[PDB]
Every structure is written in C-alpha cells, then in structure tokens.
Amino acid sequence: VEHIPFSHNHYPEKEMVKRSQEFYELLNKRRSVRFISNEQVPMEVIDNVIRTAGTAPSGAHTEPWTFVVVKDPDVKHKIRKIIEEEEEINYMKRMGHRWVTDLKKLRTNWIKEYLDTAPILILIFKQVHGFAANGKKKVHYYNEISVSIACGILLAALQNAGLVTVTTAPLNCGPRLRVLLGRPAHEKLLMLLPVGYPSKEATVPDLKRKPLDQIMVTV
Amino acid sequence: EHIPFSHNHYPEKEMVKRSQEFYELLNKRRSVRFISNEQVPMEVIDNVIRTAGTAPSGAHTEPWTFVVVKDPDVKHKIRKIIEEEEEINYMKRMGHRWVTDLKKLRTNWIKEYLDTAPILILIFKQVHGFAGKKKVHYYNEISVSIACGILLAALQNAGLVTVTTAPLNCGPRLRVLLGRPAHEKLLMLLPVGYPSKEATVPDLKRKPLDQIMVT
Ligand SMILES: Cc1cc2nc3c(=O)[nH]c(=O)nc-3n(C[C@H](O)[C@H](O)[C@H](O)COP(=O)(O)O)c2cc1C
Ligand SMILES: Cc1cc2nc3c(=O)[nH]c(=O)nc-3n(C[C@H](O)[C@H](O)[C@H](O)COP(=O)(O)O)c2cc1C
Ligand SMILES: N[C@@H](Cc1ccc(O)c(F)c1)C(=O)O
Numbered sequence: 001v002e003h004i005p006f007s008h009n010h011y012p013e014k015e016m017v018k019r020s021q022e023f024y025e026l027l028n029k030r031r032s033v034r035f036i037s038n039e040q041v042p043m044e045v046i047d048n049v050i051r052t053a054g055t056a057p058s059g060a061h062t063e064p065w066t067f068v069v070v071k072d073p074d075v076k077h078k079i080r081k082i083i084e085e086e087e088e089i090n091y092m093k094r095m096g097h098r099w100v101t102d103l104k105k106l107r108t109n110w111i112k113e114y115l116d117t118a119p120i121l122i123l124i125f126k127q128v129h130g131f132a133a134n135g136k137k138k139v140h141y142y143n144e145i146s147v148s149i150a151c152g153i154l155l156a157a158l159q160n161a162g163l164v165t166v167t168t169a170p171l172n173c174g175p176r177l178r179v180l181l182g183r184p185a186h187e188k189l190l191m192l193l194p195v196g197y198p199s200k201e202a203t204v205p206d207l208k209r210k211p212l213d214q215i216m217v218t219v
Numbered sequence: 220e221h222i223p224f225s226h227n228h229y230p231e232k233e234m235v236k237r238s239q240e241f242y243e244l245l246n247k248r249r250s251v252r253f254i255s256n257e258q259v260p261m262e263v264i265d266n267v268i269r270t271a272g273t274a275p276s277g278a279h280t281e282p283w284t285f286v287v288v289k290d291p292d293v294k295h296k297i298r299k300i301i302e303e304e305e306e307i308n309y310m311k312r313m314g315h316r317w318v319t320d321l322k323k324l325r326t327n328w329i330k331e332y333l334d335t336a337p338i339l340i341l342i343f344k345q346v347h348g349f350a351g352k353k354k355v356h357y358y359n360e361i362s363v364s365i366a367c368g369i370l371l372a373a374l375q376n377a378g379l380v381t382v383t384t385a386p387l388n389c390g391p392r393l394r395v396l397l398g399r400p401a402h403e404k405l406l407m408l409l410p411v412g413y414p415s416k417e418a419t420v421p422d423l424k425r426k427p428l429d430q431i432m433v434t
C-alpha cells in the first residue's frame with residue numbers, strides 16, 4: 001500500500017476552544033439509561049452511528065468488530081431470557097457480596113426490561129482473530145481495546161444523535177448469545193447496548209463526576 | 220438517590236442530519252504519526268480530557284488518569300524510553316508475523332513525534348482504587364478504552380490530530396518516571412497537536428457497513 005498526503009480541516013484557536021466546549025457540554029449530558037421506550041427509531045440513524053463506530057482506530061488496521069443489531073421481538077425475547085437467567089445466578093452466586101454491594105447505588109438487578117422494550121439492541125462482538133481470503137488465520141492485535149475504543153465512539157455518536165443507551169456486560173452470557181445469533185466462534189461478546197428514547201418515567205442515579213484535577217495530571 | 224432523567228430530543232430529521240455529519244467528521248480522522256511543534260491552546264486540552272471523563276465506567280468507578288506532558292525534557296526522556304523498548308520489540312519480542320503485519324504502516328522504533336508533539340497524553344488505567352482499603356474497579360480496561368474512544372472523537376472535533384499508541388513493555392519505566400502510583404498501568408499514549416505540513420498517512424480503506432454490521 002502507498003502513502004499519501006494527509007489533509008486537515010484547521011480551525012482558528014477561538015473556534016477550537018468553542019467546539020471543544022460545546023462537545024464537552026453535549027457529552028456530559030450523556031447518562032446510562034436503563035428505562036427505554038418502545039417507540040421505534042429511524043434505522044438511518046442506527047446505520048450511521050454504527051458506521052461512525054467503524055471509523056475507530058485498530059491495532060495494525062484489523063477492524064476487529066462486528067456490530068450485531070436485533071430488531072425482532074422474538075429474538076429480543078430470547079436474549080432477555082438468557083440474560084435474566086444468567087444474571088440472576090450472577091447476582092445470587094457468582095458475583096460475590098462485594099460486587100453486589102458496590103452496585104446498590106445503581107439499583108440494578110437481574111431484571112432487564114429494556115431487552116424487550118427497546119426497539120434496538122446492539123451486541124458488540126470482538127473478533128479474537130480473523131481469517132484471510134485463503135482461509136488462514138490473521139492476528140488481531142489489541143482486539144479488545146480496539147473494540148472498546150469503537151464502543152466509545154459509538155456512545156458519543158448516539159449521544160449526538162439524541163438516543164440513549166446503557167453499556168452492559170452480561171457476564172457468562174457470551175456463548176449462549178453467540179450461538180443464538182448464529183455468530184462464528186472467533187467472535188466473542190464484549191458489550192450489549194439497548195438503544196432508543198428514554199421512557200417518560202426514566203430515572204438515573206444521582207452520580208457526580210470527578211473534577212478535572214482528579215483525572216488530569218500535568219507536567 | 221435516584222432522579223428524573225432529562226433528555227435532549229431531536230426530531231427524526233435532525234437526528235439523521237446530526238448523525239450523518241458526525242459520521243463525516245469522524246471518518247476524516249486518521250492516525251497521524253507526524254506532528255508539528257506549533258503549540259496548541261491548553262483550554263482545548265482541558266476540554267477534551269474533561270470530555271473523556273464523561274465516559275461510562277463499571278460500577279461508576281472512573282478508573283482513568285490522563286497524564287499530560289508538555290515539558291521538553293520529560294518528553295525527551297519518554298522518547299528515549301520508548302525507542303529503546305520498541306527497538307527490542309521489533310528485533311526480538313514481537314515476532315516475525317507481527318513485524319510483517321506492520322510493513323504497510325511503515326512504523327519502526329523511531330518515534331520523532333515524542334519530541335515534536337507539543338503535548339503527549341498518556342492514559343493510565345487504575346486496576347483498582349482506594350477508599351482505608353482497596354476498591355474494585357470492575358471492567359477497568361474496557362472503561363478506560365471507552366474513554367480513549369471518546370477522547371479521540373473529541374480531539375477530532377476540536378481540530379487536533381494524534382495517533383493511538385501502545386508502547387509495549389514500557390509501562391513500568393514510564394510509570395516510575397512520571398511519579399504515578401503502583402495501581403496505575405499505562406494503557407496508551409497519544410501524541411497531540413497539528414499535523415506537520417509534510418504529513419503522510421497510509422492509503423487504507425475501511426470496511427463497508429455490511430462487513431461490520433449484521434441485522
Ligand atoms: C489498540 C490500538 C493500538 C495501537 N497501537 C499503535 C502503536 O503502538 N503504534 C502506532 O503507530 N499505531 C498504533 N495504532 C494505530 C493503528 O495502527 C491505526 O488505527 C490503523 O493503522 C488504522 O489507521 P487510522 O487510525 O488512520 O484509521 C493503534 C491503534 C489501536 C486501536
Ligand atoms: C465496561 C462497562 C460495563 C458496564 N456494565 C454494565 C452492566 O453490566 N449493567 C449496567 O446496568 N450498567 C453497566 N455499565 C454502566 C455503568 O454502571 C455506568 O456507566 C456508571 O454507573 C456511570 O453512569 P453514567 O454512565 O450515567 O455516567 C457499564 C459501564 C461500562 C463502562
Ligand atoms: N507499537 C509499535 C508498532 C505497532 C504495534 C502495534 C500496532 O497494533 C500498531 F498498529 C503499530 C510501534 O509503535 O511501532
């Protein structure tokens with residue numbers, strides 16, 4: 001592959017400052033929403049936020065991500081059963097006292113109503129390796145990180161398109177969900193995001209973010 | 220304590236338009252390995268980090284430390300560290316496959332951007348925290364990485380460039396050098412600023428939507 005000049009949209013410092021400020025205020029309104037209405041949402045928006053996630057950087061340009069989108073309530077209902085069953089055992093046995101306590105402030109449990117109500121579920125699978133065209137294996141360097149970075153971009157894009165979600169990690173649900181969705185073995189489930197509009201009645205926990213001087217260190 | 224969630228809603232047509240234009244802005248983002256020494260406004264840097272800090276995180280743990288280096292001398296020390304360790308990585312440690320897999324990008328162990336970039340951002344994950352005792356940081360690496368994604372969109376939005384790097388085997392030396400505690404581990408390093416006038420990128424193509432999305 002050949003290398004080409006990079007061209008760059010410049011801004012005056014004054015407009016950089018302003019774009020950076022608006023975008024802070026925009027993403028700072030983002031909250032994880034666990035109560036999602038059944039109102040349908042336009043698929044062109046979903047298509048576009050996925051395509052935005054696909055602009056992410058990736059280790060050695062491997063693009064190791066598969067975004068699986070479910071609209072079908074029958075499929076969504078099987079997903080729900082799998083996750084509620086597995087999470088009930090997670091909460092009652094596998095997570096441990098300390099994790100369960102650390103979650104009290106969030107009021108989460110194994111009941112995940114959003115898996116039926118939300119019109120869209122996005123299941124983000126990482127590809128632990130890939131395949132060349134001749135069927136031999138290719139290495140996916142830093143695949144989990146690459147996929148999580150694209151997930152961060154996806155979240156930004158959703159916030160900026162006026163949709164809500166909550167990033168979830170359905171512990172011990174990977175295999176059953178992979179099989180149910182007909183995905184191949186080199187894909188593993190990394191996170192699941194219900195997507196739509198908030199419910200009229202949606203709450204969030206009243207959490208504060210750290211001030212800049214507790215996350216940023218200069219030298 | 221739990222409160223009502225106040226959303227900011229767009230009509231379908233503004234949803235489509237905002238999402239389309241945000242795709243277009245982010246699809247112009249490229250990893251840039253040649254960075255000008257022209258200084259950049261620290262108010263932007265503060266803002267983009269602030270933005271990264273809005274990321275979700277496992278059990279609301281916020282396990283990230285963003286270490287921003289502007290000082291020439293420390294930066295030259297970071298460069299010496301990374302060049303030494305990447306030399307051994309390319310010669311010995313990565314293996315032939317991995318080195319062959321990087322030919323298209325034309326990377327080696329010389330990392331000039333570590334001196335010329337006005338700003339380095341080093342991202343440390345906190346693999347646990349402290350209350351007296353230690354706190355569990357659930358999904359810390361994934362949380363931090365999600366924060367770095369948000370940071371990259373923010374940088375792209377604010378007119379700056381960077382490249383996401385993972386300086387293999389350099390974490391311990393950089394940690395100690397920069398005064399960070401033993402519960403922080405280096406996850407990645409982003410040199411930040413304007414691209415050099417002569418900057419190039421490799422002529423890579425992204426997958427079409429139907430090769431990354433299954434319905
Ligand atoms: C997890 C991860 C680690 C990376 N590590 C390095 C690195 O150590 N050195 C480097 O030059 N580029 C690194 N990159 C940048 C990729 O090589 C780059 O994203 C890819 O070639 C695609 O180009 P683009 O970012 O311009 O789309 C990394 C990217 C990711 C996601
Ligand atoms: C890696 C990761 C995993 C998460 N997993 C879950 C989950 O399994 N269930 C859930 O309800 N929320 C999950 N969350 C959402 C967090 O609890 C949430 O981000 C945090 O409480 C802060 O709230 P905010 O997103 O409103 O800032 C996860 C977040 C991240 C980053
Ligand atoms: N870390 C090595 C090479 C490299 C390594 C891994 C990557 O995934 C990558 F894209 C590039 C370097 O900075 O040159």
Ligand SMILES: N[C@@H](Cc1ccc(O)c(F)c1)C(=O)O
Pocket residue numbers: 087103106108109110168169170171276277278279357358
């Ligand atoms: N995955 C579990 C537990 C959980 C909840 C919230 C979290 O932030 C988290 F890290 C883990 C759930 O969805 O209830």
